[PDB]
């Protein structure tokens, strides 16, 4: 197909060439006549391994060209890939300036041409951008309507600089955000030949996706730095430490621990986090990320409390009490924290937990349950249907498989608050998730 | 093997059972008489899938028993595993009360004992605990010297409650902290049949290994929760978002981005960290972790500074300028920032980077290099030898392989400051690493 590409920076030029070398008619579009002159000369504006070669191949076959003429580029192509920059404003919000101009330029170019055009955003933008800005802009400028007259979708890239090409060739995944089915299919052909999954989501979800990947990346670099700093301070090598950790593909580098949900608890995570940062503090090793964990963890408890507590009623049924399903361990259980908050603030609380139950007559914790936390434990009710019937707000606190059935057999008159993720879908006025 | 286990809690009881199911002789020991008794009836003190059944089998083959007679346990076994809990003190630090107690008794036991007894610590303890607490208390109480007379070693655990047994039978890996080969071999013979890599390291490293793993899990949950919160405030399901993130094993769930070293930079990571948090703020969504990345990131740059400016010499050579090797992209390069700080402090700064040097000749970002950051670029030097020779302190800022030679065979009279990880080993008087 014939592709126009708006913005010829690191991702735009890489695109220009990668597509042009696969059999596409590619028109590189940029505001600066230096980048374009370089392109027509078949030369790379950047130092990127193997880019020049690709670009020179684009001119030799006549499959690639550049022009500063936006309108033409549109009228001469069937698909436009938006790759212009979105730099930071002085307050952190991203500057949409460039994106807007391109959008206008495109809309104006469509007002003319009668055939359908396809506008795919690749530039990283906050969620809601395509819907609240690029669409209405194009529309208001083309006098047309997104979806019906012209296609719109988003297409995040994950190219790294200095390996943009190989990243292009072998991506982790290909993700597509679609308004119209038609625009989605076009992208599907485009990456059809790539040995990686294709993931079709709504425009917004896609926008969130690319942002999360990037912040996760900084999160990782940050972790390794803070850990390495503590390492040096205590005499060992961070590199050696992080290597071993990167060996674990069951916990450290899997999807485990990555489900958005409730605070973490137990008799290990919170103490070790406290134990290592205290030590870091003794060695004069600052550590803002490591040192914000607990703070965040508590926020999450508070959050559940604010959700549960917002329905004009004291009647709460708390399903799950141990720090996690399948164990009776109550040590630093966020659910007890939660329970204790509700009690301290006067709520009519009723609790269900068959494991904590079994333990009240079958363990080495009897003492603790009847003398250490009687104000919590005496609120335990073993009849699950009783807890549901006499509560107004039902709170799914842990992964007990028994709570699924509950999630699909919920009676009228009850609010659900989901903290682990049993809900098949997103919040409604009757059922709310802490992160959905 | 005859194995004694001190601390019949969640970790110790599981160990007792699994070990004994594997044909060893196990003496469970704990301070609580009520614990020992449930163990002698083959009953489980805790609610943990399949533990009871293991404990009864342990009894029924006479391969597993229990007592409070510490001395007897050490006297009738060749190796002990220390599994006593380590609780938090009001200040976050670790309470070695229980560990110490169990160390004293053992020492007293191995004294009266002629043959080599082997001590393994499974309890999670800070780096250096074993060298400065366990060994000394046992040496003292036993009159014997750690290493030659009795074996010592560290051996963390990654079992997760509720899947403890599965986790024991199928671990991510086995980590051995060894002092004397003898104990290291002993542990390996035990875990030989486990389908996982065995990792042998110095005590201090394994101690730091286990900790890093726990705080890393706590960070994953933390990242995931804070992302889901923002996800939900922006209208989408944080779960749909986190599933996709977890579908990427090249960048997201891989070892990339996990090398301790220098702050991140470039025109994407920092810009995106700032944008998301900015949005997060607009929406009243607290995010202590996400929101601390930049301070921490910026605290790494300053860290590199302090390293460099501590050598009583104004002559500094910065090898690498662009945000990474393989590109000339200068946007928000931490190396540039480093340079500007060094400049503002009046250092004789010389800079090598073959990519930018090339870029300021071919490419499109020459204006920036020439007219926007002249005060950095005129400190450029084309010849790497010229920079190395005329500087007293060399900085390895990015991973350009050209710098490998400099570190393998370094001209005397130079101080090395390794920001990326070229050094084969730890810090010395001539070559200092940022996280090693
Ligand atoms: N929000 C959220 N929370 C999670 C997720 N996965 C687990 N959690 C929670 O994180 C906390 C820790 O649970 P987990 O690590 O499964 O169990 P446990 O704490 O018993 O085991 C951990 O400590 C052991 C230990 O140090 O003794 C470790 O060995 C072990 O590997 C774990 O790190 C729990 O409160 C969990 O609910 C998730 O995807 N999302
Ligand atoms: N300390 C440390 N720093 C690292 C490591 N790995 C990478 N870095 C740094 O993290 C920063 C980003 O590098 P990288 O992600 O490899 O390059 P780039 O930032 O150009 O690509 C990223 O931005 C693209 C984008 O959003 O446009 C993404 O698409 C892409 O996937 C990356 O996130 C750099 O400053 C790196 O130095 C590490 O293990 N340790």
Curated annotation (Swiss-Prot), chains A, B:
This is GDP-mannose 6-dehydrogenase. Induction: Highly expressed in mucoid but not non-mucoid cells, probably activated by algR. Keywords: Alginate biosynthesis, NAD, Oxidoreductase. GO terms for molecular function: GDP-mannose 6-dehydrogenase activity; NAD binding. It is an enzyme of class 1 (oxidoreductase). Belongs to the UDP-glucose/GDP-mannose dehydrogenase family. The N-terminus (about 270 residues) binds NAD(+) and GDP-alpha-D-mannose and is joined to C-terminal domain by an exposed linker. It comes from Pseudomonas aeruginosa (strain ATCC 15692 / DSM 22644 / CIP 104116 / JCM 14847 / LMG 12228 / 1C / PRS 101 / PAO1).
């Amino acid at each position: 197909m014939r592709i126009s590409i708006f913005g010829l920076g690191y991702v735009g030029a890489v695109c220009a060439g990668c597509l042009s070398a696969r059999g596409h008619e590619v028109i590189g579009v940029d505001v600066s006549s230096t980048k374009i002159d370089l392109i027509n000369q078949g030369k790379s504006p950047i130092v990127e391994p193997g880019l020049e070669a690709l670009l020179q191949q684009g001119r030799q076959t006549g499959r690639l060209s550049g022009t500063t003429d936006f309108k033409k580029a549109v009228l001469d192509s069937d698909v436009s890939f938006i790759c212009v920059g979105t730099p930071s404003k002085k307050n952190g919000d991203l500057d949409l300036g460039y994106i807007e101009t391109v959008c206008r330029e495109i809309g104006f170019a469509i007002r003319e041409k009668s055939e359908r055009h396809t506008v795919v955003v690749r530039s990283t933008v906050l969620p809601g951008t395509v819907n609240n800005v690029v669409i209405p802009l194009i529309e208001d400028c083309s006098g047309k309507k997104a979806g019906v007259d012209f296609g719109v979708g988003t297409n995040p890239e994950f190219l790294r600089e200095s390996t943009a090409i190989k990243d292009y060739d072998f991506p982790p995944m290909t993700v597509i955000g679609e308004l119209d089915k038609q625009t989605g299919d076009l992208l599907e052909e485009i990456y059809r030949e790539l040995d990686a999954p294709i993931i079709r989501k709504t425009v917004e979800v896609a926008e969130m996706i690319k942002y999360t990947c990037n912040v996760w990346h900084a999160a990782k670099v940050t972790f390794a730095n803070e850990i390495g700093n503590i390492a040096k301070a205590v005499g060992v090598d961070g590199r050696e430490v992080m290597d071993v950790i990167c060996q674990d593909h069951k916990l450290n580098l899997s999807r485990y621990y990555m489900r958005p949900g409730f605070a973490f608890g137990g008799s290990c995570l919170p103490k070790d986090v406290r134990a290592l940062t205290y030590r870091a503090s003794q060695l004069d090793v600052e550590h803002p990320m490591l040192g914000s964990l607990m703070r965040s963890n508590s926020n999450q408890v508070q959050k559940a409390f604010d959700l549960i507590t917002s329905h004009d009623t004291r009647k709460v049924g708390l399903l799950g009490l141990s720090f996690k399903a399948g164990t009776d361990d109550l040590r630093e259980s966020p659910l007890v924290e939660l329970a204790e908050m509700l009690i301290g603030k006067g709520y009519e609380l009723r609790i269900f937990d068959r494991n904590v139950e079994y333990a009240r007559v079958h363990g080495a914790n009897k003492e603790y349950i009847e003398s250490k936390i009687p104000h919590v434990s005496s609120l335990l009710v073993s009849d699950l249907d009783e807890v549901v019937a006499s509560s107004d707000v039902l709170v799914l606190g842990n992964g007990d498989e028994l709570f699924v059935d509950l999630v699909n057999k919920t009676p009228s008159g009850k609010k659900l608050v989901d903290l682990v993720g049993f809900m098949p879908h997103t919040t409604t006025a009757q059922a709310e998730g802490i992160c959905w």
